[PDB]
Design an enzyme around this catalytic site. Structure first.
Site, PDB file in Angstrom:
ATOM      1  N   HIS A  98     -33.431  41.254 -43.076  1.00  0.00           N
ATOM      2  CA  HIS A  98     -33.424  42.208 -44.171  1.00  0.00           C
ATOM      3  C   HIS A  98     -34.813  42.858 -44.287  1.00  0.00           C
ATOM      4  O   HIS A  98     -35.781  42.185 -44.593  1.00  0.00           O
ATOM      5  CB  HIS A  98     -33.063  41.536 -45.512  1.00  0.00           C
ATOM      6  CG  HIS A  98     -31.710  40.892 -45.541  1.00  0.00           C
ATOM      7  ND1 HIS A  98     -31.437  39.776 -46.305  1.00  0.00           N
ATOM      8  CD2 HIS A  98     -30.558  41.203 -44.899  1.00  0.00           C
ATOM      9  CE1 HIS A  98     -30.179  39.419 -46.116  1.00  0.00           C
ATOM     10  NE2 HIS A  98     -29.623  40.267 -45.266  1.00  0.00           N
ATOM     11  N   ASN A 119     -34.851  32.713 -46.664  1.00  0.00           N
ATOM     12  CA  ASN A 119     -36.177  32.939 -47.287  1.00  0.00           C
ATOM     13  C   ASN A 119     -36.522  31.902 -48.321  1.00  0.00           C
ATOM     14  O   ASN A 119     -37.567  31.958 -48.966  1.00  0.00           O
ATOM     15  CB  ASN A 119     -36.309  34.353 -47.883  1.00  0.00           C
ATOM     16  CG  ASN A 119     -36.067  35.424 -46.851  1.00  0.00           C
ATOM     17  OD1 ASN A 119     -35.141  36.227 -46.972  1.00  0.00           O
ATOM     18  ND2 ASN A 119     -36.891  35.423 -45.804  1.00  0.00           N
ATOM     19  N   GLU A 143     -29.297  44.690 -44.992  1.00  0.00           N
ATOM     20  CA  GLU A 143     -28.653  44.567 -43.700  1.00  0.00           C
ATOM     21  C   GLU A 143     -29.198  45.659 -42.770  1.00  0.00           C
ATOM     22  O   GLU A 143     -29.194  46.826 -43.118  1.00  0.00           O
ATOM     23  CB  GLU A 143     -27.130  44.725 -43.820  1.00  0.00           C
ATOM     24  CG  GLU A 143     -26.448  43.768 -44.781  1.00  0.00           C
ATOM     25  CD  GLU A 143     -26.556  42.305 -44.383  1.00  0.00           C
ATOM     26  OE1 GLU A 143     -25.921  41.886 -43.390  1.00  0.00           O
ATOM     27  OE2 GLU A 143     -27.244  41.558 -45.100  1.00  0.00           O
ATOM     28  N   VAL A 183     -38.653  35.305 -42.723  1.00  0.00           N
ATOM     29  CA  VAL A 183     -40.024  35.248 -43.203  1.00  0.00           C
ATOM     30  C   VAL A 183     -40.174  33.945 -43.972  1.00  0.00           C
ATOM     31  O   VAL A 183     -39.329  33.648 -44.840  1.00  0.00           O
ATOM     32  CB  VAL A 183     -40.316  36.457 -44.121  1.00  0.00           C
ATOM     33  CG1 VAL A 183     -41.272  36.118 -45.300  1.00  0.00           C
ATOM     34  CG2 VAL A 183     -40.862  37.588 -43.308  1.00  0.00           C
ATOM     35  N   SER A 187     -33.741  38.044 -45.591  1.00  0.00           N
ATOM     36  CA  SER A 187     -33.132  37.722 -44.292  1.00  0.00           C
ATOM     37  C   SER A 187     -32.348  36.413 -44.361  1.00  0.00           C
ATOM     38  O   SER A 187     -32.693  35.522 -45.124  1.00  0.00           O
ATOM     39  CB  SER A 187     -34.206  37.611 -43.188  1.00  0.00           C
ATOM     40  OG  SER A 187     -35.011  38.766 -43.144  1.00  0.00           O
TER      41      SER A 187
END
EC number: 3.5.1.93
Lengths: 522, 159
Positions: free
Chosen positions: A23, A244, A455, A70, A1
């Protein structure tokens, strides 16, 4: 992401910009994103969330918006127990287990159910599991006493001001995630959020592994408040980001270092090439429009090629094998972009699989290792050019086996297929440097592969008045059998043709194709 | 400079666009949440019901051995019982939003039963507490504490 937020001073028009860019798996049901818009007299939210959630995770409105990535907040501990005499050893004594005989029903092949016993054992740590290898493990999860997760998130995305947002965030009811924020008043913020136990000792690697379960020394009972956690607000660099990566380059110039925080909160590992690009794309660009912001999001550079090919090509042209030499020239002529028309990219991926492992995260093949002092220009170079060329010989074989030739067009093998729509792919693996991510599957028997992950929901917002926003959802807005709204966006994705997101009543009234009147009486 | 005049809905309605995006207008918050549950059931009803059933601790009961390991994981970590507690522990106002959301799912299903797959019909009706439960499984027992990290196992999803 990925997540970007941009302060007014860094823009042409003087309004903050926000990128939502999760993601996740394209198939896993609980990871499915759904787009929606709620409006009442007292609030408005637009955005995407995971199905079954009653609050929008990736939300924005006329005042503000947020996004998530995350962070791996280590909110739980797995303790290895030492079994003795029907109990477990703890502070030098055998302590007995708490245990109830529970039960559950299991459906059989023929439609009936039988009852199955289930013993639940607990130590002071928490509930106990037996691994296949016979190891007894107790899991201690933090923030089980935080019932307000959904309400916190709701109050965050309906906040009337940044302060109200901070107050909500400070309740520590959302147990994980990096959270990036922006608003029309001009504030941007990054927070490394979650519920982290207070520990007297040990680094993150220690607390990610099996912690000794024979001592109160390792039994934490308290957690960190918000102001202990890494945060950035309106930094000098005029932006924040997270891809990330560890939270050590959330902006440029930085505003803190790893030594300012307990070592168990976040790892200090090499930043991925995607994360290095995230920092470069924001730091190096000024006077941003929404349009140039959108264009930057499409970045699909083979950053790893930039780090390895300078050394690899010459070493490879020395080799007697004419197939090795030709592969070296094909690679040298490549612009190092993951375009549909690239005849060299697939071969490059295959070399990088061996040079850096199947995850593309391996650091051992590089000449110059990663350094936080040069966080977006390391690691670099090929340590052992002779071995890397043997790796290239293998990759040549692997690429012919997988795809039929060493020079098959990237977008002929890489396809995005939903129902009957079949379109050419572009961009790819984050760990090779691609900011826009499609985690291509292994190829089928004809060498065709599709995204397993990447995506999904993509939206970019300018907090002008009114706000302007654009978005796309890779797998559409519905997965119910027969729907027209599953494959009806992926073509637009292949051309990066983003929808205008419609918040204002008059826009919604012009675009409406179905009215469902409802009424609720409790 | 002030934001644009907020819109004040005078009736409860969903306006869907050509891509299947619901724009849910509610005269108050429970109404909008009910509209949101209705829309989600329309667009994703089967998989939401499957997941809600799993978070009840009833995946093995409803669908058999493929669901059994998740059931053992959640019952052992007390997820279904704790969700009821989180539910009772909500503020009145937010609890009313969760009940409305769940009522929206129920209503969609009741009015369009052809659209709900046979093997998930046993899940209905769903409650405010099922919503809380799924969010708890997701946040704390998929994201924060995955069964794989505890049990010493392979990669996350399943494929």
């Amino acid at each position: 992401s990925n997540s970007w937020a941009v302060a007014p001073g860094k823009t042409a028009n003087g309004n903050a910009l926000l990128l939502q860019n999760p993601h996740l798996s394209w198939t896993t049901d609980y990871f499915t994103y759904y787009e929606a818009h709620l409006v009442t007299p007292d609030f408005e939210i637009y955005g995407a969330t995971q199905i079954g959630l009653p609050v929008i995770k990736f939300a924005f409105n006329q005042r503000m918006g947020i996004t998530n990535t995350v962070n791996g907040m280590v909110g739980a501990t797995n303790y290895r127990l030492t079994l003795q005499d029907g109990g477990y050893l703890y502070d030098g004594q055998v302590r007995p287990f708490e245990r109830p005989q529970a039960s559950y029903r299991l459906r059989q092949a023929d439609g009936t159910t039988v009852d199955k016993p289930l013993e639940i054992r607990s130590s002071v740590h928490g509930p106990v599991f037996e691994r296949a290898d016979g190891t007894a493990v107790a899991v201690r999860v933090a923030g089980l006493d935080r019932p307000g997760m959904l309400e916190q998130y709701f109050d965050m995305i309906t906040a009337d001001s940044f302060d109200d947002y901070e107050a909500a965030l400070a309740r520590m009811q959302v147990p994980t995630f990096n959270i990036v924020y922006a608003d029309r008043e001009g504030t941007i913020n990054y927070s490394f959020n979650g519920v982290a136990p207070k520990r007297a000792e040990g680094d993150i690697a220690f607390w990610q592994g099996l912690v000794p379960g024979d001592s109160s020394r390792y039994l934490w009972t308290e957690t960190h408040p918000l102001d202990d956690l890494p945060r950035v607000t309106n930094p000098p660099g005029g932006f924040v980001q997270n891809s990330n990566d560890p939270p050590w380059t959330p902006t440029w110039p930085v505003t803190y270092t790893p030594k300012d925080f307990p070592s168990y909160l976040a790892p200090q590992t090499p930043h991925s090439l995607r994360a290095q690009q995230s920092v470069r794309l924001m730091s190096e660009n000024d006077d941003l429009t929404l349009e140039r912001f959108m264009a930057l999001q499409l970045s699909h550079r083979a950053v790893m090629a930039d780090r390895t090919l300078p050394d690899l090509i010459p070493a490879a042209l020395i080799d007697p094998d004419p197939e090795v030499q030709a592969a070296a020239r094909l690679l040298a002529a490549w612009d190092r972009e993951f375009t549909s028309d690239s005849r060299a990219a697939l071969l490059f991926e295959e070399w990088a699989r061996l040079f850096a492992g199947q995850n593309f995260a391996g650091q051992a093949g590089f000449a110059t290792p990663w350094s936080l002092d040069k966080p977006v220009s390391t690691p670099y170079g090929v340590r052992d050019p002779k071995a890397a060329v043997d790796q290239l010989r293998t990759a040549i074989a692997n690429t012919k086996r997988k795809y039929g030739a060493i020079d098959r067009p990237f977008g002929d093998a890489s396809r995005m297929i939903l129902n009957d729509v079949n379109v050419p792919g572009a961009a790819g693996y984050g760990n090779l440097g691609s900011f826009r991510v499609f985690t291509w599957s292994d190829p089928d028997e004809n060498g065709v592969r599709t995204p397993v992950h990447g995506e999904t929901w993509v939206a970019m917002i300018e907090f002008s008045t009114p706000v302007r926003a654009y978005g796309l959802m890779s797998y559409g807005n519905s997965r119910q059998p027969g729907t027209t709204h599953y494959s009806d966006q992926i073509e637009r994705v292949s051309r990066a043709d983003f929808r205008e997101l419609l918040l204002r009543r008059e826009q919604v009234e012009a675009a409406v194709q179905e009215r469902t009147p409802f009424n609720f009486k409790p | 400079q002030a934001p644009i005049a907020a819109y004040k809905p005078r009736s409860n309605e969903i306006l869907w666009d050509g891509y299947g995006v619901p724009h849910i207008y509610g005269v108050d918050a429970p109404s909008a949440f009910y509209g949101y549950g209705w829309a989600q059931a329309r667009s994703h009803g089967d998989n939401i019901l499957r997941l809600y059933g799993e978070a009840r601790g009833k995946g093995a009961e409803y669908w058999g051995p493929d669901y059994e390991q998740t059931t053992v994981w959640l019952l052992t970590n007390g997820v279904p019982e704790r969700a009821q507690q989180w539910y009772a522990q909500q503020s009145p106002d937010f609890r009313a939003n969760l009940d409305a959301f769940a009522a929206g799912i129920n209503a969609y299903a009741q009015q369009n039963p052809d659209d709900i797959s046979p093997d998930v019909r046993q899940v209905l009706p769903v409650s405010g507490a099922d919503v809380v439960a799924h969010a708890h499984r997701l946040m704390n027992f998929l994201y924060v504490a995955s069964p794989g990290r505890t049990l010493g196992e392979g990669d996350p999803p399943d494929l």
